[PDB]
């Protein structure tokens, strides 16, 4: 599913990401934009052999099992394919564990390089939230 911007902002709020670990909703929408282009089916291989999955590009190196990332962890206790659903529940639940692990949103390379320190409130402008 390719979410609209305000559609994703509304789903992310419904699921408790607005101000989660102190990150406003616009940070999460900006991260999803530059990680996945709002596409739940996005997958991208990493140089170490892991893959990133879904709207927030969650890495099989630590967070999910994809059956082909040796010596990796599954800290969200899920198959990586769960993170590709039209239902973002599994991605949001797992993202809450990631952002809580001490690194905050710096875990998301696209967030650090493209959203951090910008006017992220712009990502929720015009949405009826
Ligand atoms: Cl933090
Ligand atoms: Na894994
Ligand atoms: Na999907």
UniProtKB/Swiss-Prot annotation:
Domain C-type lysozyme: 1-129
Tissue distribution of the protein: In the egg white and polymorphonuclear leukocytes.
Paired cysteines (S-S): 6-127, 30-115, 64-80, 76-94
Keyword Secreted (UniProt): yes
Cellular component aspect of the GO annotation: cytoplasm; endoplasmic reticulum; extracellular space
Active site: 35, 52
Subcellular location: Secreted
Keywords, ordered alphabetically: Allergen, Antimicrobial, Bacteriolytic enzyme, Disulfide bond, Glycosidase, Hydrolase, Secreted, Signal
One Gene Ontology biological process: defense response to Gram-positive bacterium
Stored Pfam families: Lys
Residues binding substrate: 101
Principal EC category: hydrolase
EC code(s) of this entry: 3.2.1.17
One GO MF term: beta-N-acetylglucosaminidase activity
Catalysed reaction equations from the record: Hydrolysis of (1->4)-beta-linkages between N-acetylmuramic acid and N-acetyl-D-glucosamine residues in a peptidoglycan and between N-acetyl-D-glucosamine residues in chitodextrins
Subunit annotation: Monomer.
Family: Belongs to the glycosyl hydrolase 22 family.
Note: Lysozyme C is capable of both hydrolysis and transglycosylation; it also shows a slight esterase activity. It acts rapidly on both peptide-substituted and unsubstituted peptidoglycan, and slowly on chitin oligosaccharides.
Function as written in the Swiss-Prot or TrEMBL entry: Lysozymes have primarily a bacteriolytic function; those in tissues and body fluids are associated with the monocyte-macrophage system and enhance the activity of immunoagents. Has bacteriolytic activity against M.luteus.
The protein's name in its UniProt record: Lysozyme C
Organism: Gallus gallus (Chicken)
Taxonomic placement: Eukaryota, Metazoa, Chordata, Craniata, Vertebrata
């Amino acid at each position: 599913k390719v979410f609209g911007r305000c559609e994703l902002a509304a789903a992310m709020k419904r699921h408790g990401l607005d101000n989660y670990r102190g990150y406003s909703l616009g940070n999460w929408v900006c991260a999803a934009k530059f990680e996945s282009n709002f596409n739940t089916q996005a997958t991208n291989r990493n140089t170490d052999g892991s893959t990133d999955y879904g709207i927030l590009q969650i890495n099989s190196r630590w967070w999910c099992n994809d059956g082909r990332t040796p010596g990796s962890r599954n800290l969200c206790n899920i198959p990586c394919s769960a993170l590709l659903s039209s239902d973002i529940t599994a991605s949001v639940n797992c993202a809450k564990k990631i952002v809580s692990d001490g690194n905050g949103m710096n875990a998301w390379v696209a967030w650090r390089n493209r959203c951090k320190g910008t006017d992220v409130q712009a990502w929720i402008r015009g949405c009826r939230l």
